[PDB]
Design a protein around this ligand. Structure first.
Ligand SMILES: Nc1ncccc1CO
Lengths: 300, 237
């Protein structure tokens, strides 16, 4: 199990670690988070008590280095940093643990929630969407815009999600206008899967990443990306059977994990109603349809 | 955005634009089969593509053969419309291509936008106006060429005849919409009013009778009264 130590907590903040969160008071003797499962990406995230606009976080994988958080009183945020000295780090962690000033990643053994939300998410692929090659971890926040949002305010601070646009030359073959618009199978299978993503796993990773950024940072562009990637599969008459079965599982855990009181801003009525009720795949998402109907019947 | 009462004068400026009406593209007679079930028999249709400034009408005749062995015909009709409009734009020289296309029905927006991806600077616009272009098949010479077509055919007309020699586009378009509104409300009455006086004929190269300026006033008046008469008949109001 791995550890993300904190130098200190000088400002009152709600700290998130994956789907867990805890309130830390101004100058509370908090020195970070231990027992973080090796094998998955993680996200640590922050919302300052004094201003809810400060909503931001770090995607990281503990297998790629030793990472700690230190408050910068100049930029006014908790920053992730890499400790390159392995022995300094092990020594720092061993003190805070001995003094028990570290919360434990509170994983229930029966609980596969984090695995199921991040199954296809890959830290090297996150680093291509969030470009900052001098760090091994990736900063995201509420206000970061997508490349696509920026086509219709700086490019170094953008989410480089794959552009999906149903009314683009990329999406529609000359001479197959009606066919390609009404059945997006060529756009999904040839352009996106074979062409850009190379395989379904990569496609799912970006979809899962987009969801998580939407849920943890309320990132509007990530929400648009998650819905677009769902809509392109549901609007395709021809999808491999395994992708459909996997999609149902992916979406089930996303709807399951969503805060009950956020459905209204994070879920798109048109997309969900289309995907569950009208689309080619309206019959292929049993789990997702059952949880959506039982948990958010108003939206439908 | 949407073409309405407020931005009406834009139709008559010097930016080339076309109205597209798809309401006569897919045309059926509903009939009883021998087993007492219902079936449609398609008849020839047309795309009504009009430059409201010049009166140039691009009447693409939709021959029933287009529909042979196709399903979801009301849906196909919107995509066939979009395909024909995009082929017409491509066939025009660059300086003749429209800057805007206004569809009379919102269901044409996506089919036309998708067929016009090669033309990102041509704006595809809905309208809030209820235009009577459906009544185009009440103009005898337009109905005649559509029903006689034995294959796909484009026929060029000026829907204003020689009116622009005497009046502006604004006035010509107002006259055209009043005529088509009348033909749509009561075709019988509308054409009795147009042909009541045998001394006023339709030139071979024209669609409408050769009315003097004062005779147009009287016709225009009779058309308004008919649109009122039949508004009275309908609501008893
Ligand atoms: N697999 C992935 N994981 C996280 C973001 C993006 C992808 C796809 O390249």
């Amino acid at each position: 199990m791995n550890t993300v130590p904190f130098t200190s907590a000088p400002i009152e903040v709600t700290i998130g670690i994956d789907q867990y969160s805890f309130n830390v008071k101004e100058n509370q003797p908090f020195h970070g988070i231990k027992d973080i499962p090796i094998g998955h990406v993680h996200v640590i995230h922050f919302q300052h008590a004094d201003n809810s606009s400060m909503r931001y976080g770090y995607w990281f994988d503990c297998r790629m280095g030793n990472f700690y958080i230190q408050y910068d009183p100049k930029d006014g945020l908790y920053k992730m940093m890499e400790e390159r000295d392995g022995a300094k780090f092990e020594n720092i962690v061993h003190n805070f643990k001995e003094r028990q000033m570290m919360v434990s990643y509170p994983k229930i053994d029966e609980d596969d929630t984090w695995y199921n939300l991040t199954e296809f998410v890959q830290m090297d692929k996150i680093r291509k969407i969030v470009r900052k090659d001098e760090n091994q971890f990736s900063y995201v926040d509420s206000s970061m815009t997508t490349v696509q949002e920026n086509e219709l305010s700086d490019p170094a601070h953008s989410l480089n999600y794959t552009v999906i646009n149903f009314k683009s030359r990329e999406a529609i073959r000359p001479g197959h206008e009606m066919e390609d618009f009404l059945d997006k199978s060529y756009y999904l299978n040839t352009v996106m899967l074979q062409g850009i993503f190379k395989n379904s796993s990569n496609y799912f990773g970006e979809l899962q990443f987009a969801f998580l950024n939407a849920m943890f940072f309320g990132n509007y562009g990530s929400s648009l990306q998650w819905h677009a990637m769902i809509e392109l599969i549901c609007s395709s008459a021809t999808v491999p059977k395994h992708m459909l079965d996997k999609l149902d599982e992916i979406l089930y855990y996303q709807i399951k994990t969503l805060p009950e009181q956020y459905s209204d801003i994070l879920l798109n009525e048109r997309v969900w109603n289309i995907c569950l009720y009208s689309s080619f795949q309206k019959n292929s998402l049993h789990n997702t349809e059952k949880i959506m109907e039982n948990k958010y019947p108003e939206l439908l | 955005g949407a073409m309405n009462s407020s931005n009406y004068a834009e139709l008559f400026n010097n930016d080339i634009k076309l109205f597209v009406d798809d309401t006569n593209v897919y045309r059926v007679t509903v009939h009883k089969t021998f087993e007492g079930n219902v079936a449609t028999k398609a008849i020839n249709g047309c795309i009504f593509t009009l430059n409201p400034k010049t009166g140039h009408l691009f009447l693409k005749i939709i021959h029933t053969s287009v529909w042979a062995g196709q399903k979801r015909l009301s849906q196909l009709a919107k995509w066939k419309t979009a395909e024909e409009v995009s082929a017409l734009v491509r066939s025009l020289p660059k300086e003749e291509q429209p800057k805007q296309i206004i569809v009379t029905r919102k269901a044409m927006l996506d089919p036309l936008e998708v067929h016009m991806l090669d033309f990102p600077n041509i704006a595809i616009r809905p309208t809030e106006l209820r235009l009577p272009f459906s009544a185009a098949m009440s103009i005898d010479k337009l109905s005649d060429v559509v029903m006689k077509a034995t294959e796909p055919q484009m026929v060029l007309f000026n829907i204003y005849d020689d009116w622009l020699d005497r009046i502006s586009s604004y006035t010509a378009f107002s006259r055209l919409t009043l005529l088509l509104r009348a033909l749509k409300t009561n075709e019988e009455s509308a054409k009795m009013i147009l042909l009541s006086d045998p001394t006023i004929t339709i030139k071979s190269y024209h669609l409408w009778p050769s009315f003097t300026d004062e005779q147009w006033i009287t016709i225009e008046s009779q058309m308004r009264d008919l649109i009122l008469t039949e508004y009275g008949r309908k609501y008893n109001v």
